[PDB]
mmCIF file with all atom_site columns, C-alpha atoms and ligand atoms in Angstrom:
data_model
loop_
_atom_site.group_PDB
_atom_site.id
_atom_site.type_symbol
_atom_site.label_atom_id
_atom_site.label_alt_id
_atom_site.label_comp_id
_atom_site.label_asym_id
_atom_site.label_entity_id
_atom_site.label_seq_id
_atom_site.pdbx_PDB_ins_code
_atom_site.Cartn_x
_atom_site.Cartn_y
_atom_site.Cartn_z
_atom_site.occupancy
_atom_site.B_iso_or_equiv
_atom_site.pdbx_formal_charge
_atom_site.auth_seq_id
_atom_site.auth_comp_id
_atom_site.auth_asym_id
_atom_site.auth_atom_id
_atom_site.pdbx_PDB_model_num
ATOM   1   C  CA  . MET A 1 1   ? 20.124 6.911   -16.002 1.00 0.00 ? 1   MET A CA  1
ATOM   2   C  CA  . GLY A 1 2   ? 19.519 4.325   -14.729 1.00 0.00 ? 2   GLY A CA  1
ATOM   3   C  CA  . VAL A 1 3   ? 19.445 3.909   -10.954 1.00 0.00 ? 3   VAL A CA  1
ATOM   4   C  CA  . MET A 1 4   ? 18.303 0.816   -9.053  1.00 0.00 ? 4   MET A CA  1
ATOM   5   C  CA  . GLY A 1 5   ? 18.331 0.105   -5.327  1.00 0.00 ? 5   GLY A CA  1
ATOM   6   C  CA  . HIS A 1 6   ? 16.558 -1.762  -2.564  1.00 0.00 ? 6   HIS A CA  1
ATOM   7   C  CA  . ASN A 1 7   ? 16.625 -1.355  1.197   1.00 0.00 ? 7   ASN A CA  1
ATOM   8   C  CA  . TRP A 1 8   ? 14.786 -2.996  4.082   1.00 0.00 ? 8   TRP A CA  1
ATOM   9   C  CA  . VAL A 1 9   ? 12.943 -0.704  6.496   1.00 0.00 ? 9   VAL A CA  1
ATOM   10  C  CA  . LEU A 1 10  ? 10.775 -1.610  9.492   1.00 0.00 ? 10  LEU A CA  1
ATOM   11  C  CA  . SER A 1 11  ? 8.055  0.451   11.164  1.00 0.00 ? 11  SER A CA  1
ATOM   12  C  CA  . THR A 1 12  ? 4.577  0.184   12.596  1.00 0.00 ? 12  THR A CA  1
ATOM   13  C  CA  . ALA A 1 13  ? 1.958  -0.306  9.892   1.00 0.00 ? 13  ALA A CA  1
ATOM   14  C  CA  . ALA A 1 14  ? 0.559  3.144   10.720  1.00 0.00 ? 14  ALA A CA  1
ATOM   15  C  CA  . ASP A 1 15  ? 3.906  4.928   10.211  1.00 0.00 ? 15  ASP A CA  1
ATOM   16  C  CA  . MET A 1 16  ? 4.717  3.143   6.933   1.00 0.00 ? 16  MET A CA  1
ATOM   17  C  CA  . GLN A 1 17  ? 3.356  5.698   4.455   1.00 0.00 ? 17  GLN A CA  1
ATOM   18  C  CA  . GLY A 1 18  ? 4.897  8.647   6.288   1.00 0.00 ? 18  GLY A CA  1
ATOM   19  C  CA  . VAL A 1 19  ? 8.318  6.980   6.291   1.00 0.00 ? 19  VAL A CA  1
ATOM   20  C  CA  . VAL A 1 20  ? 8.033  6.153   2.576   1.00 0.00 ? 20  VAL A CA  1
ATOM   21  C  CA  . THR A 1 21  ? 7.075  9.733   1.683   1.00 0.00 ? 21  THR A CA  1
ATOM   22  C  CA  . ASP A 1 22  ? 9.779  11.541  3.669   1.00 0.00 ? 22  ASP A CA  1
ATOM   23  C  CA  . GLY A 1 23  ? 12.204 8.897   2.417   1.00 0.00 ? 23  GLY A CA  1
ATOM   24  C  CA  . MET A 1 24  ? 11.490 9.815   -1.202  1.00 0.00 ? 24  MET A CA  1
ATOM   25  C  CA  . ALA A 1 25  ? 12.007 13.490  -0.329  1.00 0.00 ? 25  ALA A CA  1
ATOM   26  C  CA  . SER A 1 26  ? 15.384 12.820  1.313   1.00 0.00 ? 26  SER A CA  1
ATOM   27  C  CA  . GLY A 1 27  ? 16.871 11.533  -1.933  1.00 0.00 ? 27  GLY A CA  1
ATOM   28  C  CA  . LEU A 1 28  ? 19.322 8.921   -3.124  1.00 0.00 ? 28  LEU A CA  1
ATOM   29  C  CA  . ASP A 1 29  ? 22.228 10.317  -1.073  1.00 0.00 ? 29  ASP A CA  1
ATOM   30  C  CA  . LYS A 1 30  ? 20.396 9.525   2.192   1.00 0.00 ? 30  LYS A CA  1
ATOM   31  C  CA  . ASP A 1 31  ? 19.370 5.980   1.164   1.00 0.00 ? 31  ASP A CA  1
ATOM   32  C  CA  . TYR A 1 32  ? 15.895 7.432   0.548   1.00 0.00 ? 32  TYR A CA  1
ATOM   33  C  CA  . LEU A 1 33  ? 15.250 7.677   4.294   1.00 0.00 ? 33  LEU A CA  1
ATOM   34  C  CA  . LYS A 1 34  ? 14.993 10.709  6.538   1.00 0.00 ? 34  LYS A CA  1
ATOM   35  C  CA  . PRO A 1 35  ? 18.090 10.530  8.783   1.00 0.00 ? 35  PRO A CA  1
ATOM   36  C  CA  . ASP A 1 36  ? 17.150 9.587   12.365  1.00 0.00 ? 36  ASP A CA  1
ATOM   37  C  CA  . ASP A 1 37  ? 13.495 8.978   11.535  1.00 0.00 ? 37  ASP A CA  1
ATOM   38  C  CA  . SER A 1 38  ? 12.019 8.076   14.921  1.00 0.00 ? 38  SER A CA  1
ATOM   39  C  CA  . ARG A 1 39  ? 9.374  5.915   13.219  1.00 0.00 ? 39  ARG A CA  1
ATOM   40  C  CA  . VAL A 1 40  ? 12.039 3.568   11.793  1.00 0.00 ? 40  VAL A CA  1
ATOM   41  C  CA  . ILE A 1 41  ? 12.688 0.672   14.178  1.00 0.00 ? 41  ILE A CA  1
ATOM   42  C  CA  . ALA A 1 42  ? 15.542 -0.723  12.059  1.00 0.00 ? 42  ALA A CA  1
ATOM   43  C  CA  . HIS A 1 43  ? 16.773 -0.500  8.479   1.00 0.00 ? 43  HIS A CA  1
ATOM   44  C  CA  . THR A 1 44  ? 19.500 -1.632  6.119   1.00 0.00 ? 44  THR A CA  1
ATOM   45  C  CA  . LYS A 1 45  ? 21.328 0.708   3.782   1.00 0.00 ? 45  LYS A CA  1
ATOM   46  C  CA  . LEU A 1 46  ? 20.418 1.094   0.119   1.00 0.00 ? 46  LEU A CA  1
ATOM   47  C  CA  . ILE A 1 47  ? 22.192 -1.558  -1.943  1.00 0.00 ? 47  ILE A CA  1
ATOM   48  C  CA  . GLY A 1 48  ? 22.677 -1.940  -5.679  1.00 0.00 ? 48  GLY A CA  1
ATOM   49  C  CA  . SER A 1 49  ? 22.724 -5.053  -7.822  1.00 0.00 ? 49  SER A CA  1
ATOM   50  C  CA  . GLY A 1 50  ? 25.196 -7.594  -6.458  1.00 0.00 ? 50  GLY A CA  1
ATOM   51  C  CA  . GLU A 1 51  ? 25.588 -5.959  -3.030  1.00 0.00 ? 51  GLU A CA  1
ATOM   52  C  CA  . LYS A 1 52  ? 24.521 -7.066  0.436   1.00 0.00 ? 52  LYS A CA  1
ATOM   53  C  CA  . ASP A 1 53  ? 23.796 -5.467  3.794   1.00 0.00 ? 53  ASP A CA  1
ATOM   54  C  CA  . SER A 1 54  ? 22.468 -6.610  7.157   1.00 0.00 ? 54  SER A CA  1
ATOM   55  C  CA  . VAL A 1 55  ? 20.735 -5.002  10.122  1.00 0.00 ? 55  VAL A CA  1
ATOM   56  C  CA  . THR A 1 56  ? 20.173 -6.366  13.628  1.00 0.00 ? 56  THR A CA  1
ATOM   57  C  CA  . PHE A 1 57  ? 17.676 -4.976  16.127  1.00 0.00 ? 57  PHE A CA  1
ATOM   58  C  CA  . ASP A 1 58  ? 16.523 -5.703  19.667  1.00 0.00 ? 58  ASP A CA  1
ATOM   59  C  CA  . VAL A 1 59  ? 13.350 -7.795  19.803  1.00 0.00 ? 59  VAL A CA  1
ATOM   60  C  CA  . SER A 1 60  ? 12.536 -5.771  22.940  1.00 0.00 ? 60  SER A CA  1
ATOM   61  C  CA  . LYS A 1 61  ? 11.549 -2.908  20.598  1.00 0.00 ? 61  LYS A CA  1
ATOM   62  C  CA  . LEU A 1 62  ? 8.580  -4.945  19.299  1.00 0.00 ? 62  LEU A CA  1
ATOM   63  C  CA  . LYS A 1 63  ? 5.329  -6.115  20.902  1.00 0.00 ? 63  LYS A CA  1
ATOM   64  C  CA  . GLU A 1 64  ? 3.229  -9.257  20.455  1.00 0.00 ? 64  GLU A CA  1
ATOM   65  C  CA  . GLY A 1 65  ? -0.038 -7.542  19.506  1.00 0.00 ? 65  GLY A CA  1
ATOM   66  C  CA  . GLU A 1 66  ? 1.029  -4.817  17.081  1.00 0.00 ? 66  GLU A CA  1
ATOM   67  C  CA  . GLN A 1 67  ? 1.187  -4.677  13.294  1.00 0.00 ? 67  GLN A CA  1
ATOM   68  C  CA  . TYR A 1 68  ? 4.625  -4.052  11.813  1.00 0.00 ? 68  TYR A CA  1
ATOM   69  C  CA  . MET A 1 69  ? 5.488  -3.475  8.165   1.00 0.00 ? 69  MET A CA  1
ATOM   70  C  CA  . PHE A 1 70  ? 8.730  -4.024  6.317   1.00 0.00 ? 70  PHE A CA  1
ATOM   71  C  CA  . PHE A 1 71  ? 9.188  -2.324  2.973   1.00 0.00 ? 71  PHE A CA  1
ATOM   72  C  CA  . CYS A 1 72  ? 11.594 -0.690  0.551   1.00 0.00 ? 72  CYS A CA  1
ATOM   73  C  CA  . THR A 1 73  ? 11.589 3.112   0.447   1.00 0.00 ? 73  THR A CA  1
ATOM   74  C  CA  . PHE A 1 74  ? 13.170 3.445   -2.996  1.00 0.00 ? 74  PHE A CA  1
ATOM   75  C  CA  . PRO A 1 75  ? 10.670 5.715   -4.821  1.00 0.00 ? 75  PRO A CA  1
ATOM   76  C  CA  . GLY A 1 76  ? 7.730  3.688   -6.088  1.00 0.00 ? 76  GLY A CA  1
ATOM   77  C  CA  . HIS A 1 77  ? 9.059  0.337   -4.871  1.00 0.00 ? 77  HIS A CA  1
ATOM   78  C  CA  . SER A 1 78  ? 6.969  0.253   -1.670  1.00 0.00 ? 78  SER A CA  1
ATOM   79  C  CA  . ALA A 1 79  ? 3.927  -0.652  -3.821  1.00 0.00 ? 79  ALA A CA  1
ATOM   80  C  CA  . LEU A 1 80  ? 4.999  -4.298  -4.233  1.00 0.00 ? 80  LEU A CA  1
ATOM   81  C  CA  . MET A 1 81  ? 8.027  -4.363  -1.903  1.00 0.00 ? 81  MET A CA  1
ATOM   82  C  CA  . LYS A 1 82  ? 6.263  -4.582  1.436   1.00 0.00 ? 82  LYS A CA  1
ATOM   83  C  CA  . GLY A 1 83  ? 5.158  -7.194  3.930   1.00 0.00 ? 83  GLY A CA  1
ATOM   84  C  CA  . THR A 1 84  ? 4.189  -7.885  7.517   1.00 0.00 ? 84  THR A CA  1
ATOM   85  C  CA  . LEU A 1 85  ? 6.513  -8.707  10.399  1.00 0.00 ? 85  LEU A CA  1
ATOM   86  C  CA  . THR A 1 86  ? 4.935  -10.155 13.535  1.00 0.00 ? 86  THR A CA  1
ATOM   87  C  CA  . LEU A 1 87  ? 6.282  -11.406 16.858  1.00 0.00 ? 87  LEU A CA  1
ATOM   88  C  CA  . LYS A 1 88  ? 5.336  -14.922 17.974  1.00 0.00 ? 88  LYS A CA  1
ATOM   89  C  CA  . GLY A 1 89  ? 6.664  -17.837 19.985  1.00 0.00 ? 89  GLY A CA  1
ATOM   90  C  CA  . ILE A 1 90  ? 7.047  -21.111 18.005  1.00 0.00 ? 90  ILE A CA  1
ATOM   91  C  CA  . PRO A 1 91  ? 7.718  -24.481 19.751  1.00 0.00 ? 91  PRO A CA  1
ATOM   92  C  CA  . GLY A 1 92  ? 11.443 -24.961 19.188  1.00 0.00 ? 92  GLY A CA  1
ATOM   93  C  CA  . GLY A 1 93  ? 12.671 -22.463 19.648  1.00 0.00 ? 93  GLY A CA  1
ATOM   94  C  CA  . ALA A 1 94  ? 14.763 -20.114 17.499  1.00 0.00 ? 94  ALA A CA  1
ATOM   95  C  CA  . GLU A 1 95  ? 15.941 -19.104 14.122  1.00 0.00 ? 95  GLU A CA  1
ATOM   96  C  CA  . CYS A 1 96  ? 16.710 -15.446 14.869  1.00 0.00 ? 96  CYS A CA  1
ATOM   97  C  CA  . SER A 1 97  ? 17.632 -14.348 11.337  1.00 0.00 ? 97  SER A CA  1
ATOM   98  C  CA  . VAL A 1 98  ? 16.135 -14.314 7.829   1.00 0.00 ? 98  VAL A CA  1
ATOM   99  C  CA  . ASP A 1 99  ? 17.562 -13.893 4.309   1.00 0.00 ? 99  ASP A CA  1
ATOM   100 C  CA  . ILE A 1 100 ? 15.610 -11.577 1.970   1.00 0.00 ? 100 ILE A CA  1
ATOM   101 C  CA  . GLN A 1 101 ? 16.164 -10.777 -1.712  1.00 0.00 ? 101 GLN A CA  1
ATOM   102 C  CA  . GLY A 1 102 ? 14.896 -7.855  -3.752  1.00 0.00 ? 102 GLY A CA  1
ATOM   103 C  CA  . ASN A 1 103 ? 15.140 -8.408  -7.491  1.00 0.00 ? 103 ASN A CA  1
ATOM   104 C  CA  . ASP A 1 104 ? 14.752 -6.333  -10.666 1.00 0.00 ? 104 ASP A CA  1
ATOM   105 C  CA  . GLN A 1 105 ? 10.928 -6.609  -10.749 1.00 0.00 ? 105 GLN A CA  1
ATOM   106 C  CA  . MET A 1 106 ? 10.177 -4.685  -7.517  1.00 0.00 ? 106 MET A CA  1
ATOM   107 C  CA  . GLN A 1 107 ? 9.719  -7.893  -5.517  1.00 0.00 ? 107 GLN A CA  1
ATOM   108 C  CA  . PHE A 1 108 ? 10.802 -9.177  -2.154  1.00 0.00 ? 108 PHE A CA  1
ATOM   109 C  CA  . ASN A 1 109 ? 10.990 -12.968 -2.011  1.00 0.00 ? 109 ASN A CA  1
ATOM   110 C  CA  . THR A 1 110 ? 8.866  -13.004 1.150   1.00 0.00 ? 110 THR A CA  1
ATOM   111 C  CA  . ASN A 1 111 ? 5.796  -11.016 2.183   1.00 0.00 ? 111 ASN A CA  1
ATOM   112 C  CA  . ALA A 1 112 ? 5.614  -12.140 5.834   1.00 0.00 ? 112 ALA A CA  1
ATOM   113 C  CA  . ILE A 1 113 ? 8.316  -12.470 8.494   1.00 0.00 ? 113 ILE A CA  1
ATOM   114 C  CA  . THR A 1 114 ? 7.897  -14.208 11.842  1.00 0.00 ? 114 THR A CA  1
ATOM   115 C  CA  . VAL A 1 115 ? 10.168 -13.263 14.736  1.00 0.00 ? 115 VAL A CA  1
ATOM   116 C  CA  . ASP A 1 116 ? 10.331 -15.696 17.643  1.00 0.00 ? 116 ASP A CA  1
ATOM   117 C  CA  . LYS A 1 117 ? 10.190 -14.026 21.048  1.00 0.00 ? 117 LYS A CA  1
ATOM   118 C  CA  . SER A 1 118 ? 12.818 -16.359 22.501  1.00 0.00 ? 118 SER A CA  1
ATOM   119 C  CA  . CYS A 1 119 ? 15.147 -14.257 20.319  1.00 0.00 ? 119 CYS A CA  1
ATOM   120 C  CA  . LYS A 1 120 ? 16.731 -11.351 22.151  1.00 0.00 ? 120 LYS A CA  1
ATOM   121 C  CA  . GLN A 1 121 ? 17.835 -9.877  18.794  1.00 0.00 ? 121 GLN A CA  1
ATOM   122 C  CA  . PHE A 1 122 ? 16.889 -10.432 15.146  1.00 0.00 ? 122 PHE A CA  1
ATOM   123 C  CA  . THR A 1 123 ? 18.994 -10.215 11.985  1.00 0.00 ? 123 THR A CA  1
ATOM   124 C  CA  . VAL A 1 124 ? 17.916 -9.364  8.422   1.00 0.00 ? 124 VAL A CA  1
ATOM   125 C  CA  . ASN A 1 125 ? 20.318 -10.239 5.596   1.00 0.00 ? 125 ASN A CA  1
ATOM   126 C  CA  . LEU A 1 126 ? 19.267 -8.276  2.515   1.00 0.00 ? 126 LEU A CA  1
ATOM   127 C  CA  . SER A 1 127 ? 20.762 -9.041  -0.876  1.00 0.00 ? 127 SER A CA  1
ATOM   128 C  CA  . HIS A 1 128 ? 20.147 -7.595  -4.337  1.00 0.00 ? 128 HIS A CA  1
ATOM   129 C  CA  . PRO A 1 129 ? 21.079 -10.332 -6.816  1.00 0.00 ? 129 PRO A CA  1
ATOM   130 C  CA  . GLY A 1 130 ? 21.740 -9.950  -10.512 1.00 0.00 ? 130 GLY A CA  1
HETATM 131 CU CU1 . CU  B 2 .   ? 18.104 9.713   -15.248 1.00 0.00 ? 201 CU  B CU1 1
HETATM 132 CU CU1 . CU  B 2 .   ? 13.457 -1.418  -3.758  1.00 0.00 ? 202 CU  B CU1 1
HETATM 133 CU CU1 . CU  B 2 .   ? 19.253 4.747   11.422  1.00 0.00 ? 203 CU  B CU1 1
#
């Protein structure tokens, strides 16, 4: 086989590689993440084709002048399945959620996520179509 999954994991840009590596070593049964990894600010579960999962996190855990990375920890996928997430304030002001897809070609459909700081909490809706 014949296994395919995506997840959505958030950490500081510095902690990204460490989270990816220990995630690989934790295996499929643990959603390819080390349980209770302190470096992981928020994460979805691992989902197969046709499934969906969401995660919500406090915007208080972020900071305006820091680099944050979102990525999939499924072994090898973090090469192309990564992107930046940054905190900003846009004149508006809201949308406090985003819809992300990972497909069969190791791709997220966005590579940059903006979180407004008027949001007290932020919501990621991950799907895995096909
Ligand atoms: Cu196999
Ligand atoms: Cu993936
Ligand atoms: Cu957790």
